[PDB]
Design a protein around this ligand. Sequence first.
Ligand SMILES: NC(=O)c1ccc[n+]([C@@H]2O[C@H](COP(=O)([O-])OP(=O)(O)OC[C@H]3O[C@@H](n4cnc5c(N)ncnc54)[C@H](OP(=O)(O)O)[C@@H]3O)[C@@H](O)[C@H]2O)c1
Ligand SMILES: NC(=O)c1ccc[n+]([C@@H]2O[C@H](COP(=O)([O-])OP(=O)(O)OC[C@H]3O[C@@H](n4cnc5c(N)ncnc54)[C@H](OP(=O)(O)O)[C@@H]3O)[C@@H](O)[C@H]2O)c1
Ligand SMILES: NC(=O)c1ccc[n+]([C@@H]2O[C@H](COP(=O)([O-])OP(=O)(O)OC[C@H]3O[C@@H](n4cnc5c(N)ncnc54)[C@H](OP(=O)(O)O)[C@@H]3O)[C@@H](O)[C@H]2O)c1
Ligand SMILES: NC(=O)c1ccc[n+]([C@@H]2O[C@H](COP(=O)([O-])OP(=O)(O)OC[C@H]3O[C@@H](n4cnc5c(N)ncnc54)[C@H](OP(=O)(O)O)[C@@H]3O)[C@@H](O)[C@H]2O)c1
Lengths: 489, 489
Amino acid sequence: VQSDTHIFIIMGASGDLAKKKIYPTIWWLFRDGLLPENTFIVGYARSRLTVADIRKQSEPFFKATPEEKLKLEDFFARNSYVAGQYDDAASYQRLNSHMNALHLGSQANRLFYLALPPTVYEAVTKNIHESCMSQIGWNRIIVEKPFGRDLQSSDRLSNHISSLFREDQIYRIDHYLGKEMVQNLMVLRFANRIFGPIWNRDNIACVILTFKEPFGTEGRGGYFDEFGIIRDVMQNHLLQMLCLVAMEKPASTNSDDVRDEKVKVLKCISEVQANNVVLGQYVGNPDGEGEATKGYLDDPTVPRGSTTATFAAVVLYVENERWDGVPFILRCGKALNERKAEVRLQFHDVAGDIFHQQCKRNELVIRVQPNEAVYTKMMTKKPGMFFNPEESELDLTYGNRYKNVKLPDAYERLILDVFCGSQMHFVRSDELREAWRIFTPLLHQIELEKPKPIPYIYGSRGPTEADELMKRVGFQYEGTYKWVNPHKL
Amino acid sequence: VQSDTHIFIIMGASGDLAKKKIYPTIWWLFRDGLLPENTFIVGYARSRLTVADIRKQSEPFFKATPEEKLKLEDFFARNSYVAGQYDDAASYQRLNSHMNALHLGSQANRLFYLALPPTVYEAVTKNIHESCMSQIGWNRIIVEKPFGRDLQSSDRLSNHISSLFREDQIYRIDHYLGKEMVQNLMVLRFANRIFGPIWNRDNIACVILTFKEPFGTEGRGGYFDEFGIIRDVMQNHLLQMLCLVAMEKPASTNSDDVRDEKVKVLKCISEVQANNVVLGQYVGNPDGEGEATKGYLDDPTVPRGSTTATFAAVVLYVENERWDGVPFILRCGKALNERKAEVRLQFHDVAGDIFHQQCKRNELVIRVQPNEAVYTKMMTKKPGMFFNPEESELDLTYGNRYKNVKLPDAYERLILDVFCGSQMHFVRSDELREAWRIFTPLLHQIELEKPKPIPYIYGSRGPTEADELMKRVGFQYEGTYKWVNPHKL
Ligand SMILES: NC(=O)c1ccc[n+]([C@@H]2O[C@H](COP(=O)([O-])OP(=O)(O)OC[C@H]3O[C@@H](n4cnc5c(N)ncnc54)[C@H](OP(=O)(O)O)[C@@H]3O)[C@@H](O)[C@H]2O)c1
Ligand SMILES: NC(=O)c1ccc[n+]([C@@H]2O[C@H](COP(=O)([O-])OP(=O)(O)OC[C@H]3O[C@@H](n4cnc5c(N)ncnc54)[C@H](OP(=O)(O)O)[C@@H]3O)[C@@H](O)[C@H]2O)c1
Ligand SMILES: NC(=O)c1ccc[n+]([C@@H]2O[C@H](COP(=O)([O-])OP(=O)(O)OC[C@H]3O[C@@H](n4cnc5c(N)ncnc54)[C@H](OP(=O)(O)O)[C@@H]3O)[C@@H](O)[C@H]2O)c1
Ligand SMILES: NC(=O)c1ccc[n+]([C@@H]2O[C@H](COP(=O)([O-])OP(=O)(O)OC[C@H]3O[C@@H](n4cnc5c(N)ncnc54)[C@H](OP(=O)(O)O)[C@@H]3O)[C@@H](O)[C@H]2O)c1
């Protein structure tokens, strides 16, 4: 019967993430009535803008409709901008008195989004806690990757922030956690007797965690050159997915227990081993149709003779009862053959074969994107006047089963969570350090040795070696699976 | 490099099963090149017909095409008819010398199909063994239900035939064994790690085996009145399906081991208990659209005041390690709400619930007919801005996944088996007696007590009581499952 004032402070407001993703996202939650009734958006950046510029530059990303006119007017009335520098005490004084001057702004819950480069993280978090914290409502900070470049460097930042804010005030973002299917992992796993007594090392051969993009560096490879693919996609997104697949059942669905089960899994993995690694970097394709005839080193923005790899495949192992000996294959790449983020389980051969080496390993597949789907590869009998078993599947395809239902962006989910104080889809500090300690020794190693990557053509599935690493750990491919979309249901 | 002569003797040739199903079936195997090159069809009946009459009365069931003209000419050239009585020694002498006069007819393998009423079974099997058996090739007899009316009466016949023929010469028919999906049970179960470690009493709540027809007695209820629904559909088809679901993994896929695993299951079931039974007999529907306004007792062919039931539901139990305490619900009926033959597994609730009593029991469904399909009911998460788990499914629907593929009749499968000497889809003598010993005490009981059936309207799902019996043993229904066929795959 009574609602508190809320203030969404967009720091670094003037940037592209803010104009292309943050502003447009907070409108959508506003538009769809998902935010608290008394909500105010506050922009903070060094540039000297007016709510009119902020609107003019973002409104083209809002995807607005004419019937939304009023809502839009009211969304902008609840908007304000405060110019200032990121480490100027005076500046943070203006921003603070700016919020208390807001309807019940002294009691309001304050949410600070850091739509800024990593180089201000310390100055900003310091200044916020010092002068911009509400003495009444709650204060939650949202942060973006990168969170350090290795253990040691992620430790500095991590302990700086932890020195000012408690875990319950820190929201580290891995947008994969805001993904529909990635969130469905826990429902598939702990809601189904059918997917439970089978989630062990007695039944699973290997686990594969893939992420592919069909595009190369695309202009700005000079930025990628500095961090790489491991730090980019493997050390977080893929590793996050590993945690959700290998995690023990939580005491509950809450942040505490969920995230406790994840780091617990992580603390059981050893520093990735070089023999369990394959790095690639794409060359172009002379038969390619344009933009894909240029390879990594064909980006005049990328340093000449760059040894950086745009593709990596790694094999990890969870040294625990459930997953002892089951290899977890982390596989990501650019300039590949398609866009696809995926989780696959390949189960072990059945014991006591009675179909003459005709059966193939079962496989549960959770496709995160595109085209959300979950499907099992199982053995059925060749339909008709045949008795020989053949491969088929039991399928669940969003886009057909749930056409009406409209699916939100990971950022819409994640930002709503913050307002509601749910933290299960945000990276904990310990979860963070376990992740860096696993991949650091390797990253450093690549940094001191110029292991020249494995050439692979803009479009392929990567280096042949990557498939040989999978096969070697237990993953067997046959190429016999035949699939045909449907018709006339 | 060398092929033996084969003779398909159709006894009782002149009948409807022979004209509507046997003649038309053997042509189809002929047409599709499935039979041995030197194959001859021999018709034997009391009526005095010519291969021309046999053709004229059956050809309208052949589903022939104009391009099949030659094949048809050759199929009829390989046809002959021999008139005779069923117990006249002279008659069997003509029939025998008739076959040796056939190209290598003294060495030919002889297949005798008993397209006759049960009342000649003794006279015919006796006479066949006495005078019509090949001293060189093999002799296999095919028999149709009914095989007795109870244990004692099925025992007489069974030991009469067993006195003349060895098990390897006896092919008892349950056409369900010739059904695509019924045959797929063993591939689903023993080819899939996903459907194996879950097939126990620790994971399964109950098993349901349904068979429905949307039609009533339809004219000839005077025939049904004599045998009932239990003897008709339950004591064989449903019970056969029970065996395939509850059966241990066989040492091999061969007749010996497969059928050994089935009777083994049967010898672990106790005489069905009256408290575990619900009988119904349909009344009509005044709102019904014609033919379904008349009930069972509205068939002037059915005895006035018939207590016979046209619907029964029974609960059995396999007293063995795997299925201890799991009720097997056998459910069949007429004048019901649809045509459907089905196998369902309802699994047990998950242990350590973390979704607040929101989860529902998983269910694996194998639909034998119509529209061949296998689908699992599992818990997925409400797509979109929701976290509450909801029911969905992983589906396999023949008709969409395998449209091209053309599916044969159970009789096409079963007859081919006989030619090839495979017996796994034919009822063994012991398998037979175990089945009668389970249902006999009940059948008799119904025979001495006029338990008036449970009235139910032509169209419903049966008597409400039937659902109350299921619920009482463990099967829980909720009515929350929502399903929508597809589009735009
Ligand atoms: N978009 C991405 O791919 C992406 C992806 C994931 C996470 N994020 C995180 O969210 C941030 C999004 O912001 P952005 O990507 O849009 O960065 P950005 O464009 O470089 O700058 C964002 C804002 O910060 C200020 N700024 C930039 N460089 C600065 C510098 N060297 N010194 C002082 N102020 C500086 C600019 O405002 P003033 O000129 O007014 O100072 C600008 O309005 C990223 O840094 C990233 O960490 C981004
Ligand atoms: N629900 C759905 O919409 C649906 C349902 C069922 C199937 N399908 C489709 O049907 C096709 C087949 O499905 P599938 O991809 O899951 O099974 P699959 O073709 O048998 O492939 C097995 C996996 O091994 C990888 N692989 C390919 N070539 C290899 C090689 N030479 N050596 C080693 N590993 C190799 C592939 O990885 P990558 O290809 O990922 O690199 C693939 O994921 C897919 O394209 C899929 O989209 C779709
Ligand atoms: N169609 C069904 O629903 C069905 C289903 C499953 C199994 N089957 C089995 O296969 C058989 C199919 O034959 P049917 O159903 O077509 O039976 P049917 O029409 O009564 O007679 C079949 C043949 O046997 C002869 N016959 C019939 N009654 C006789 C009697 N009282 N004494 C002597 N000969 C007699 C007739 O030939 P003559 O006049 O030349 O002697 C007729 O050509 C059934 O008996 C059944 O056991 C049938
Ligand atoms: N692959 C496919 O084509 C496909 C896939 C998925 C679902 N579907 C369809 O979607 C619909 C739902 O599937 P479903 O039938 O498997 O699940 P369901 O509707 O949840 O029904 C559960 C089972 O309990 C029975 N039942 C109904 N009312 C009851 C009551 N009041 N008390 C006790 N038991 C009761 C039903 O038996 P009976 O109805 O058999 O008497 C039904 O088989 C079905 O019509 C099905 O055809 C089709």
